[PDB]
Amino acid sequence: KHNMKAFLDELKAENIKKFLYNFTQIPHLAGTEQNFQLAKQIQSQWKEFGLDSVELAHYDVLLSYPNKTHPNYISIINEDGNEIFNTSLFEPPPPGYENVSDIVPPFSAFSPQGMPEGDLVYVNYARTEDFFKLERDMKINCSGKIVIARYGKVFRGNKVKNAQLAGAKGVILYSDPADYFAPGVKSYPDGWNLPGGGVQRGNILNLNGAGDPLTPGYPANEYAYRRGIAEAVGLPSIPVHPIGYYDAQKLLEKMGGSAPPDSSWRGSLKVPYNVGPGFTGNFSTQKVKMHIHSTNEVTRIYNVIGTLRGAVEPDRYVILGGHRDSWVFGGIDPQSGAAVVHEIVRSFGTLKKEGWRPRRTILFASWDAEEFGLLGSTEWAEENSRLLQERGVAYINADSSIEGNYTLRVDCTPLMYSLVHNLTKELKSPDEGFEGKSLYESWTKKSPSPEFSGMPRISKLGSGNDFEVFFQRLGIASGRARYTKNWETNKFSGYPLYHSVYETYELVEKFYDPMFKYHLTVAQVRGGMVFELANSIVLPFDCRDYAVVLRKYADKIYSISMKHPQEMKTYSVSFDSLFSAVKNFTEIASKFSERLQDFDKSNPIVLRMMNDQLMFLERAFIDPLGLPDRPFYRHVIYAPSSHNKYAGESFPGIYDALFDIESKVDPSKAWGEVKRQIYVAAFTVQAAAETLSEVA
């Protein structure tokens, strides 16, 4: 038969392994010839696999590259202007890749150019609370200083924004072994740890969902009108550069001024972690000098878009998308995901060649320029926003398949909780000790829900990947899944070799997943979700799961406000309308679920009428006016944290109105805005609930 089992059985670990090897032999940096060649290869292969059409969609977007003949580096300079220490010009290449051409050296993409020279202030992780501690408590002023910040905890673009706002004239990012060196594990190539010469690449934009800096709101097509640089969205105003911990130790070791305020400011290097500013007595006349010569350049990028047309609802789209561009070899990020997508396409194509089609259309996407700010996914979504908003059922992301090998991670809309629970109960666990058990069983045992007994953890979607435009701008139900680390025992950030030259095929094959069993499990989770979404008669969304989470989020935001009881009294700040809206959503969702199970199952119009109510439910949380000063974050329930793009925040409008409210100079205005955000949230919740009422 042609059912989900046939689809799942056709997926092969050996094929994913072959595809990963094929995708990781040379770098595929966005905007380069090598990445265009890979796009053409994937287009050809998807056509051979059996898709109905496979096209390239190209855009000309702002990218950023170092200057090949004027390299970026940081110096310590003495008072005579002699450069007495210089940071590395490149990462030592891994074994057997020492002759590989076009490895981009470490840089912070979109840094402006400059040669700032000054005294160093150490700012821990450069989080909002680290700057509060510096300014408010320690009385240390970052104005005109170069700040040095360790990577980890929050997206690097937020670190840069924070340092800017503090008055820094430059930022040095580094990987501390505390965050990137797991105890008892060897450095690459002998283990999966970051060596002292390893460096994390990555963009430092603050786009807030805009896509290409030059064309916010519209696709960067052939006739696009571009903003000038000075009006571009999200570019940093001060030079920024990343270094490894051998170079960081040389910059930190001479630091003087104030002691670190507490142990949470100390990494693992043999240095005092003094905050500064500047160096101790003997070295006090020395300074730090950055030399950044990178350039921003409008550059063509290419998405591959494959279509498998639906048999019954060809105007309903289920999208499986992940990116193809990499910083260097992309052994994990993204090619561990792209190899999984490739095998998924191949499996669907095998069924299609035997005469099967899914009920709904499935679109497959190989996005470009994700590493430069989600640029390929967002420009294509801007070009196709009308089709997506009226026909888009769901988006399933497919970046890295592994960030560890311990258990499953899922982040998604509450509309997909039941789907995920049900699918994982039918899949085999790949874990040692769980032979013959379900994936649901091993995942729930290893990663218990903080709320419910015998349920697994599912997180909110944050951001920092290609689902952002589909979920927080367009309101299309979205999800992601991968294998992850043991969250109890592993205190490090992500995986140690993230966005380094050392992220290779060998890293994966030797240290993460030699049997490709975790990759296969992730292909079964992502593929199975796409299968159910595209083939289930009734869309596999449970609106009642949204009701449960809305109450949890309402309790949470109310609890934050309730730290200020005097102000709530004075300004008559009530959450009554929001709780009322959540109560109503709960009631209306229950009655809808009854209809959904009791409706005349012979009637396709009642069915699609009810499928449209299911599809447009995520869409109902969109506010066309967007969130304050973030017009492309339009979802009222979920936005990326204003302090950390990677983290989701619930009721973000209210959260940001309440954040550090006790420091606002005009409490009446600040609490008025809290009340405005309560109104907007309560209204949006009730309006979303009413989409599930009887239609007439």
Ligand X SMILES: *[C@@H]1O[C@H](CO)[C@@H](O[C@@H]2O[C@H](CO)[C@@H](O[C@@H]3O[C@H](CO[C@H]4O[C@H](CO)[C@@H](O)[C@H](O)[C@@H]4O)[C@@H](O)[C@H](O[C@H]4O[C@H](CO)[C@@H](O)[C@H](O)[C@@H]4O)[C@@H]3O)[C@H](O)[C@H]2NC(C)=O)[C@H](O)[C@H]1NC(C)=O
Ligand Y SMILES: *[C@@H]1O[C@H](CO)[C@@H](O[C@@H]2O[C@H](CO)[C@@H](O[C@@H]3O[C@H](CO)[C@@H](O)[C@H](O)[C@@H]3O)[C@H](O)[C@H]2NC(C)=O)[C@H](O)[C@H]1NC(C)=O
Ligand Z SMILES: *[C@@H]1O[C@H](CO)[C@@H](O[C@@H]2O[C@H](CO)[C@@H](O)[C@H](O)[C@H]2NC(C)=O)[C@H](O)[C@H]1NC(C)=O
Instruction: Name which of residues 577 to 616 contact ligand Y (CB under 6 A).
Output: 597-598
Residue from the set 542, 545, 649, 656 that interacts with ligand Y by CB under 6 A: 542
Neighbours of 408 (CB within 10 A): 28
Residues 321-340: x/- map of binding to Zn ion (CB under 5 A)? ------------xx------
Active-site residue, selected from the candidate residues 58, 241, 342, 635: 635
Measure the CA–CA gap between 193 and 183, rounded to whole angstroms. Answer: 9
Q: Is 143 a catalytic residue?
A: no
Stretch that binds ligand X, among 92-100, 415-423, 437-445, 580-588 (CB under 6 A): 580-588
Residue (of 320, 322, 324) closest to 301 by Cα position = 324
Query: Can you list the alpha helix ranges (DSSP code H) found in 457-600?
Result: 467-468, 505-506, 517-535, 543-561, 565-570, 576-598
- Check residue 102 for interaction with ligand Z (CB under 6 A): no
Measure the CA–CA gap between 549 and 377, rounded to whole angstroms. Answer: 28
Number of chain residues interacting with a copy of itself (CB under 8 A): 53
Residue from the set 183, 217, 454, 565 that interacts with a copy of itself by CB under 8 A: 217
Q: Least separation, in Å, of the C-beta of 465 and Cl ion?
A: 6
Cα distances from 382 to residues 30, 128, 625, 637, in angstroms, run 19, 32, 16, 22
Residue from the set 5, 9, 14, 41 that interacts with ligand Z by CB under 6 A: 41
Stretch that binds ligand Z, among 40-48, 174-182, 442-450, 595-603 (CB under 6 A): 40-48
Instruction: Name which of residues 38 to 97 contact ligand X (CB under 6 A).
Output: 55-56, 58
Q: Is 635 a catalytic residue?
A: yes
Cβ nearer to Zn ion, comparing 333 with 431: 333
Sequence-separated (6 or more) residues with CB below 8 Å from residue 439: 408, 424, 425, 427, 428, 429, 430, 521, 524, 525
- Check residue 205 for interaction with ligand Y (CB under 6 A): no
Q: If you count them, how many residues does the chain have? A: 696
Stretch that binds ligand Z, among 38-46, 106-114, 206-214, 330-338 (CB under 6 A): 38-46
Instruction: Write the DSSP string, 56-109.
Output: EEEEEEEEEE--TTS--EEEEE-TT--EEEE--SSPPPPTT-TT-S-PPPS-EE
Cβ nearer to ligand Y, comparing 116 with 540: 540
Q: Is 612 a catalytic residue?
A: yes
SS3 561: helix
Measure the CA–CA gap between 299 and 109, rounded to whole angstroms. Answer: 14
Q: Which does 577 bind (CB under 5 to 8 A by kind): ligand NAG, ligand X, Zn ion, none?
A: ligand X
Contact 447, 410 (CB under 8 A): no
Q: How many CA atoms lie within 13 A of 479 on its CB side?
A: 26
Q: Least separation, in Å, of the C-beta of 48 and ligand Z?
A: 8
Please report, in range form, the residues annotated as the binding site for Zn(2+): 323, 333, 371, 399, 499
Contact 614, 543 (CB under 8 A): yes
Stretch that binds ligand Y, among 341-349, 414-422, 562-570, 636-644 (CB under 6 A): 414-422
SS3 576: helix
Q: Is 506 a catalytic residue?
A: no
Residue from the set 155, 327, 470, 512 that interacts with ligand NAG by CB under 6 A: 512
- Check residue 399 for interaction with Cl ion (CB under 5 A): yes
- Check residue 69 for interaction with ligand NAG (CB under 6 A): yes
Query: Can you list the alpha helix ranges (DSSP code H) found in 169-267?
Result: 177-180, 245-252
Contact 274, 256 (CB under 8 A): yes
Residue (of 659, 660, 629) closest to 557 by Cα position = 659
Residue 579, strand partner residues: none
- Check residue 528 for interaction with ligand Y (CB under 6 A): no
Cα distances from 414 to residues 77, 303, 452, 550, 580, in angstroms, run 54, 29, 15, 10, 20
Question: Which residues contribute to the site for ligand Y (CB under 6 A)?
Answer: 418-419, 422, 540, 542, 597-598
Q: Which residues bind a copy of itself (CB under 8 A)?
A: 52, 217-219, 221, 223-225, 307, 309-310, 312-315, 317, 361, 383-387, 390-391, 576-577, 604-605, 608-609, 612-613, 616, 619-620, 623-625, 631, 672, 675-676, 678-680, 682-683, 687-688, 690-691, 695-696
Interface contacts to ligand NAG, rule CB under 6 A: 67, 69-70, 75, 83-86, 141, 143-144, 192, 295, 404-405, 511-512
Q: Which positions lie near ligand X, rule CB under 6 A?
A: 55-56, 58, 222, 577, 580-581, 584, 682, 686
Residues taking part in catalysis: 370, 574, 612, 635
